[PDB]
C-alpha cells in the first residue's frame, strides 16, 4: 500500500512507508518488483524527475 499525496503550496510529496509513516522523495528505499509492475505508469511520472 505505497500511496502518494501531492504536497501542496510548496511542501514536498509524501509516500506511505510500510510502518504507516509518510516520507518525502529522498534517501534509500526498498521495493519489491511487484509494486513497480503494478504501477509502472503512475510511478515513473512521479519518480523519474
Amino acid at each position: 500500500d505505497c500511496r502518494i499525496s501531492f504536497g501542496m503550496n510548496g511542501a514536498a510529496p509524501m509516500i506511505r512507508d510500510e510502518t504507516g509513516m509518510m516520507v518525502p522523495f529522498e534517501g534509500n528505499w526498498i521495493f519489491p518488483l511487484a509494486l513497480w509492475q503494478m504501477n509502472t505508469r503512475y510511478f515513473n511520472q512521479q519518480f523519474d524527475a
Binding site: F6, R41, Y42, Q45
Partner: protein, 49 residues
C-alpha cells in the same frame, strides 16, 4: 384436466448475482486549478471498480 402446462422451474444464471448498481450522478472535475491532472488515476486510463 387432461394435460396442464408444466412450469419451467430449473433455470440457470451465468453472470454475477446482484440487483444493486452504483451509478454516477454528477461528473467530477478532473482538470482543476488546485490539483494537477497527473494526480488522478483517470488520466492514466486505469480501470476502477
Amino acid at each position: 384436466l387432461l394435460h396442464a402446462d408444466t412450469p419451467r422451474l430449473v433455470t440457470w444464471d451465468a453472470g454475477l448475482c446482484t440487483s444493486f448498481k452504483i451509478v454516477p450522478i454528477v461528473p467530477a472535475q478532473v482538470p482543476q486549478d488546485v490539483l494537477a491532472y497527473t494526480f488522478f488515476t483517470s488520466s492514466y486510463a486505469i480501470q476502477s471498480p
